[PDB]
Structure 1
Amino acid sequence: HWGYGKHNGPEHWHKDFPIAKGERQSPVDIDTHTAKYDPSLKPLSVSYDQATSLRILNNGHAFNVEFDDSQDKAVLKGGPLDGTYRLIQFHFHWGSLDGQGSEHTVDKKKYAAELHLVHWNTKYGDFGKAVQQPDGLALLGIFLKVGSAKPGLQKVVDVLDSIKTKGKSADFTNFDPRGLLPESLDYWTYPGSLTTPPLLECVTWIVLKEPISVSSEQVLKFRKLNFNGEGEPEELMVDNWRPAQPLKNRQIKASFK
């Protein structure tokens, strides 16, 4: 099956998932000089005050912090979006070294990591139905650079030892994802896709311009995770990022002047 190893990585995905060579694939490089300010874009509305985290799972390609999305609690609205999108999970992509790890790039710059908060459009009733629609998901992307620690990330990093290997999960209640947001909600937006198989073209991307800072110790702990299952030969979970894809017939819009 697909992965990020030497023989099943992103350059191989198209064989099982032909949409990998599609017209609206993600991630992409954000060329800051070509992205146009769009005065018609509204402020993002991130309402996470009532977010209910439940569990954290190592799924063999990342770790997902999962939320209770059976009610309208943690929602993303406004910005380029029409309607309401419910938070279902967040996860990260990171590198083996600080000089790579992010999926989106900014003027070809790679960040050390990238956070994805995944939300589905409530007009489609459930996540499974939403991913079959061009406006089914809204993904909020946030870059991580290495510097000062992010206090709000530490509860995530400290639980990672308990989910080292594929298929392991742990209770993870009462985690507040507001602690992962940067100061500014300025963003770029474009239509794209899931960045892991099945690579469905169902995502409105909202990528924040301001990165958050995390410490070297924090990201080092990400890199102690395993792609493999318990008892199997150790493959460190690093470089679980898909590289930039062709922009094709798309425009990236900026929310800021």
Structure 2
Amino acid sequence: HWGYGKHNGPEHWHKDFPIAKGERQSPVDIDTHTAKYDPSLKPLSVSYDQATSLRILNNGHSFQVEFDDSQDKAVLKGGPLDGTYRLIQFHFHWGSLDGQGSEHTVDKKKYAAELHLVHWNTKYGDFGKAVQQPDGLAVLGIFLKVGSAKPGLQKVVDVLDSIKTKGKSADFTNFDPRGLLPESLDYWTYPGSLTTPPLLECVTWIVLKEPISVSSEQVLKFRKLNFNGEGEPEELMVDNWRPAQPLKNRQIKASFK
């Protein structure tokens, strides 16, 4: 099965998922000098005050916090989106070292980690139908750099002990994802894909310009998670990021000058 090691990592994925060599794959390098400012783009509208988190899960390739998405509780609108997208989960990608770990890069700069907040377009009724549509998902990407601790992340770091191995889950209620946002919502946006199999090209990417800072101690705890299940030989969950893919016929647009 696919993963991030030498015999099953990203360079191998195309044998089981040939869309890996597709026309609108993610992530990409954001060249800040060639991105086009578009005054037509609207500000993002993030409405997370009624979010209901349920659970945190180690899925064997990352950890993810899941939200109740049976109603319009936590939604993203605006920016380049048409319609309403509900939050279903967020997860992270990170490195074995502070100088790598993000999926997107900015002028080839890598960050220590990247947060993905995944939302699906309510017009398609459920997540499984949305991923089959070119405008089915909207993913907010936030970079993490190492510096000062992020208070709103600590609740997450504290429970990782309890979901160390693949398939472990824990109740995780009353977590407010607003504490993970930077001050500014300026963004870049381009059409792309999921960055893990099945790599479907159903995502409008919205990547925030401003990183959030986390402390070395906080990302250290990420690196203690395991890819393996309980009882299996220990393999640390690190470097679970896909490298930048060719931009091909796409335009990155910026909401700012």
- Deviations, residues 53-93 of structure 1 (Å, cap 9, x unaligned): 00000000000100000011100000000000000000000
Provide the rounded CA distance (Å) in 2 between the counterparts of 1:141 and 1:103.
9
Once the two structures are superposed, the pairs formed by residues 215-234 of structure 1 within 5 Å of their partners are 215-234=215-234
Provide the rounded CA distance (Å) in 1 between the counterparts of 2:33 and 2:235.
39
Provide the rounded CA distance (Å) in 2 between the counterparts of 1:152 and 1:227.
25
Provide the rounded CA distance (Å) in 2 between the counterparts of 1:231 and 1:223.
19
Q: Identity, % of aligned pairs?
A: 99
Task: State the shift of 1:105 in Å.
Answer: 0.2
For the aligned residue pairs, the C-alpha RMSD in angstroms reads: 0.3
Provide the rounded CA distance (Å) in 1 between the counterparts of 2:57 and 2:86.
19
Provide the rounded CA distance (Å) in 1 between the counterparts of 2:5 and 2:129.
30
- Deviations, residues 94-132 of structure 1 (Å, cap 9, x unaligned): 000000000000000000000000000000000000000
Task: State the shift of 1:42 in Å.
Answer: 0.1
Task: State the shift of 1:31 in Å.
Answer: 0.1
- Deviations, residues 4-57 of structure 1 (Å, cap 9, x unaligned): 011100000000000000000000000000001000000000100000000000
TM-score (norm 1): 1.00
The residue matched to 1:204 in structure 2 has which SS?
strand
Shift >2 Å, 4+ stretches? none
TM-score (norm 2): 1.00
User: Which position in structure 2 is the counterpart of 1:20?
Assistant: 20
Task: State the shift of 1:224 in Å.
Answer: 0.1
Aligned length, in residue pairs: 257
- Deviations, residues 142-198 of structure 1 (Å, cap 9, x unaligned): 000000000000000000000000000000000000000000000000000000000
The residue matched to 1:90 in structure 2 has which SS?
strand
Question: Unaligned 5+ residue runs, structure 1?
Answer: none
User: Which position in structure 2 is the counterpart of 1:74?
Assistant: 74
User: Which position in structure 1 is the counterpart of 2:193?
Assistant: 193
Provide the rounded CA distance (Å) in 1 between the counterparts of 2:76 and 2:113.
22
User: Which position in structure 2 is the counterpart of 1:37?
Assistant: 37
Provide the rounded CA distance (Å) in 1 between the counterparts of 2:189 and 2:80.
7
The residue matched to 1:92 in structure 2 has which SS?
strand
